[model samples]
Target: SRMRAVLHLEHKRYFQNHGHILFEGLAPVSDCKQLEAELKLFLKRWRENVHRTLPGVQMIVKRVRLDHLAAELTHRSRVALVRDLWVQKQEEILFDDCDCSVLLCLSGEKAGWGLFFSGEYPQDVFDWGAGDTAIILRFSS
Candidate 1:
């Protein structure tokens, strides 16, 4: 599951940097067991290089996507899910704008081909929700 590994990498990076910051929906440890161990080990090592007061500290953000405050505040999505207007905005950014502000909406499942509102399909393909959940990684400089 290379894709899972990739998600792990992203999560580890974010957690290590923002461990002090309260995060939501970081259960990955249960859903993805292998990653759990790796993450614990990662946190241990990360503290060494990171140098913080509460070494190896972590917080979870449950239902991050579902939360309204989470939406209002800065965020990041996995890939590009065109579920609503916001997703459409991501499409615009990926195709046009590279403002350093990024959003990702990932599709773990292969349900994209099956569309709800039937219409002349566009050339690009989208992921359907089933197998994999979207990965939103928010960052700013």
Candidate 2:
């Protein structure tokens, strides 16, 4: 679960001469119940920190079909089911122009692995009825 907090200050007194404009906190180390508790506490402390510190305020595109995005990866292609990509760095795994269709398979209470991909055009990555009722459950507040 994740939440974004935004504070609007109309009073000039709320302004700080030097401070942060944004704060991002991630709690990927806990179960859902623990996460809820941790997030609740985090938000409370965060608001308090904001009120105390008074640092100021304020905070992708369409989903392209990626059906069989990783299908073309021959045995020669580098594959690493990694928890961190930087540590797994290899010459082949790094590129903005990585033309492979990336399919991110995320699981657990935290984030997951992905195969980054791209294509020359939309037709290269479009899916044929890949939708399932299972899709909605994968998305929640």
Candidate 3:
């Protein structure tokens, strides 16, 4: 199924006006589960790599159908996965200058959810807690 078809006209307008929007079921739960599994392996390799940068996990945006959703929301065909962040119990302040981005709740108690936003916005104060994990998929125009 085409991921862009899942978005409605109102969603587009909301993103335009608010610069951000939250989604409940952007991708299938099964797909999220599979991605989480794959991420574990990726994390292992990334940790073992001598030139590791961030230490956590992509092949992810395409797997979650985020590329299509981002294209429709941002109206940019050249979508790329800029960065991904693994959320733990620690709170974080997220801010970047990418063209667009999506946050995915891949596992934990709050799984199978997502958030999309325009890069023009300010910082995201993420108050994470126990039993919750997330990843941020950023894009550039």
Best by TM-score: 3
Question: Which has the better lDDT: candidate 2, or candidate 3?
Answer: 3
Better of 2 and 3 by TM-score: 3
Deviating ranges (above 4 Å) for candidate 2:
1-72, 81-101, 105-141
Put down candidate 2 lDDT per residue, 1-141, tens digits, no spaces: 444323334211222322111111111222222322333344441322121221110000011211221222221233322111111112222223332323221223222222333322123222212221000001101
RMSD of every prediction: 17.0, 21.5, 4.8
**Which candidate has the top score in lDDT?**
3
By lDDT rank, best first, the candidates go 3, 1, 2
What C-alpha lDDT do the candidate models reach, one value each? Answer: 0.26, 0.22, 0.62
> Candidate 1 overall Cα lDDT vs. reference?
0.26
Q: Compared with the true structure, what per-residue lDDT tens digits does model 3 show for residues 114-140?
A: 788865323453333465656666677
State TM-scores per candidate: 0.19, 0.16, 0.70
- Output candidate 3 Cα RMSD: 4.8
- Candidate 1, run of 10 with poorest lDDT: 111-120
- What is the lDDT, from 0 to 100, of the residue 96 in candidate 3? 65
